[PDB]
């Protein structure tokens, strides 16, 4: 089968060409190496060559990465990034997928190398107009963005780690400092992120309370959920792994609604208001049919007692 081999080898010449192709590739490498992804070896190989190429896994340097290039200054003063945010989020997602669930080519050797490079990116980031306004816009959008993507990689990187959580805090404080001078790359690390925030506890009350105990990162979590539900509700489909296949959307929608609704109702609450209000609008006007379960998804534990007119009446009740 020379199909996928010659096809990836043709789209290699889409590896860096004007930086719109770069954005769709950084989005779509993950989908190809997920669903039709028997051939994830060379896929991770292409990501690995690219990432450890423009970005640098060097030691003890100035910036955590080598942003100088990911910018329209990487052309002729033109504002075409070749976005480090794109390839960064793509690296973190598609590596998490291929490595951790793939055995649960660029995948494995890239796995060791990306482990080193990702621990480096965390420790080396958190460890610290008009004319050049090109530089400020491009550089800063990338800086805050790479912060968000690495934030998610860490945010799932540690099960109960206070060290993972500390680096979460550091990335978040960096992001807030990026606010001083946003379409977060937070597909489920801002969708199953908040499960601990609007949760109550499991074990690491010290871990979780060192993780979110700011109200800066708490605002970052609520704002990721808010920006996200809104983009799906009206703008279009979605940002990360779960836009285009709306079954994932409905499932995570029912879940995030459950948790955000709890943290609104029982307990800043203006945010839970503003988000559930945007969301219930998205749920009446996106899942028309699926609404029969989806409203039930917040109020039920198992859908074995009633129908949708029973659902209209009883959900209006609740």
């Amino acid at each position: 089968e020379a199909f996928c081999l010659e096809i990836l080898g043709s789209l290699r010449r889409c590896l860096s060409q004007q930086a719109d192709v770069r954005l769709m590739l950084y989005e779509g490498f993950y989908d190809v190496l997920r669903r039709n992804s028997q051939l994830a070896s060379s896929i991770m190989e292409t990501l690995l060559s690219q990432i450890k190429q423009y970005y640098l896994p060097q030691q003890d340097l100035l910036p955590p990465l080598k942003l100088e290039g990911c910018i329209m200054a990487q052309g002729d003063q033109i504002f075409l990034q070749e976005p480090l945010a794109h390839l960064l989020c793509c690296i973190q997602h598609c590596l998490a997928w291929y490595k951790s669930t793939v055995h649960l080519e660029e995948e494995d050797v890239g796995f060791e190398q990306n482990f080193e490079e990702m621990l480096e990116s965390v420790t080396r980031r958190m460890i610290k107009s008009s004319g050049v306004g090109v530089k400020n816009n491009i550089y800063a959008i990338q800086v805050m963005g790479i912060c968000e993507v690495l934030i998610e990689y860490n945010f799932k990187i540690g099960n109960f780690s206070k060290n993972k959580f500390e680096d979460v805090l550091g990335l978040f404080t960096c992001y807030n400092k990026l606010s001083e001078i946003s379409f977060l790359s937070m597909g489920f690390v801002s969708t199953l992120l908040t499960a601990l925030f609007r949760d109550n506890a499991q074990s690491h009350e010290e871990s979780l309370a060192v993780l979110r105990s700011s109200t800066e990162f708490m605002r970052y979590a609520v704002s990721v959920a808010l920006q996200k539900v809104q983009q799906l509700e009206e703008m279009g489909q979605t940002d990360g792994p779960d836009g285009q296949n709306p079954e994932k959307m409905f499932q995570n929608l029912c879940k995030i609604t459950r948790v955000l609704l709890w943290r609104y109702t029982s307990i800043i609450s203006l945010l839970c208001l503003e988000g559930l209000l945007r969301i219930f609008n998205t749920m009446q006007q996106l899942y028309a049919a699926r609404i029969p379960q989806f409203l039930q998804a917040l109020d039920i534990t198992d859908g074995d007692a009633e129908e949708a007119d029973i659902n209209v009446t009883e959900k209006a009740a609740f």
Binding site: Q17, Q18, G75, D76
Partner: protein
């Protein structure tokens, strides 16, 4: 002398020429062959230079020149120069080889096929300077030849600048008109570099030939058709639209006018302003009626007011 020694890497036969003595492996076999001799076994660079000369004894036999581009069963779709012809350390080396292939030469156009999306090399800017430089000693077949291949797939940082360099050279001939117009159909060597170049385009073909009519029309309209490029349409309607083999001339006029008639919709408004503004009333071209057959009658949904202006001066 270590020519077939380079065959030790992944399989290269010292064939007679057109017989592509492949390896039974190609894709990483040639890179193995430029690692084994061209990097490790004979010398770091020295094996590269000696093997260059050692196959260079073969380079008088243009079977091993043109079998490089030709079809013959390779290692398992090219031959020696073309099939396994990729070296990043051999970037400037086979670049000097490209200069050496340039002067005698087509064969240089098959070397431009060998460039046709060439290997992503050490520096496209030195390559682009060299390619344009050895075109001023040779004919526009080699000029427009290498303009074709670089015209879409080229470095794009000095690429768009060198594009504007040739579009600053694009006045003196009508050679670079079509070759520019391909990558000035694909892209823009500058953003209003495109717009200034299309500012070249209006008088760029006032009394042009037959085929330069369809080509320079494809450029003079569809290169960068902005909103105000609708007025662009009007300019052309004044200049070269005196509508005249001959049906082939009509076929090229139609190729331009009708690949644009349903490509970008603005040409609909363009032919509307070409007639209805000041031609579909006062001093009409027969190409006015023809283009009305194309634009003013042949629109998908741009026909209702196409009928309104269609009978508009059709009534008065």
């Amino acid at each position: 002398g270590v020519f077939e020694e380079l065959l030790r890497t992944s399989g290269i036969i010292l064939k007679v020429g057109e017989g592509q003595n492949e390896i039974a492996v190609d894709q990483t076999a040639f890179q193995k062959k430029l690692r084994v001799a061209l990097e490790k076994h004979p010398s770091y660079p020295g094996v590269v230079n000696e093997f260059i000369s050692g196959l260079e004894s073969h380079i008088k036999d243009r079977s091993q020149f043109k079998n490089c581009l030709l079809p013959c069963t390779p290692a398992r779709c090219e031959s020696l120069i073309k099939l396994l012809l990729g070296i990043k350390i051999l970037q400037p080396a086979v670049v000097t080889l490209l200069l050496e292939k340039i002067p005698e030469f087509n064969f240089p156009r098959l070397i431009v096929n060998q460039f046709k999306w060439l290997d992503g090399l050490l520096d496209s800017q030195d390559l682009v300077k060299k390619l344009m430089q050895m075109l001023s000693v040779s004919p526009v077949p080699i000029q427009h030849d290498i303009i074709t291949s670089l015209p879409e797939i080229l470095e794009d940082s000095q690429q768009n600048e060198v594009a504007r360099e040739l579009s600053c050279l694009l006045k003196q001939g009508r050679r670079l008109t079509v070759p520019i117009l391909d990558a000035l159909s694909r892209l823009d060597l500058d953003a209003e570099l495109l717009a200034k170049v299309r500012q070249s385009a209006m008088t760029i073909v006032p009394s042009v030939k037959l085929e330069d009519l369809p080509v320079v029309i494809k450029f003079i309209l569809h290169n960068v058709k902005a909103a105000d490029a609708v007025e662009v349409i009007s300019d052309l309607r004044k200049s070269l639209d005196l509508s005249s083999t001959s049906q082939n001339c009509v076929k090229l006029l139609f190729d331009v006018i009708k690949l644009a008639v349903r490509f970008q919709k603005d040409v609909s408004e363009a032919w509307i302003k070409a007639i209805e503004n000041s031609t579909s009333v006062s001093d009409h071209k027969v190409l006015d009626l023809i283009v009305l057959l194309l634009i003013h009658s042949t629109n998908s949904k741009n026909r209702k007011q196409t009928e309104k202006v269609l009978r508009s001066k059709i009534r008065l």
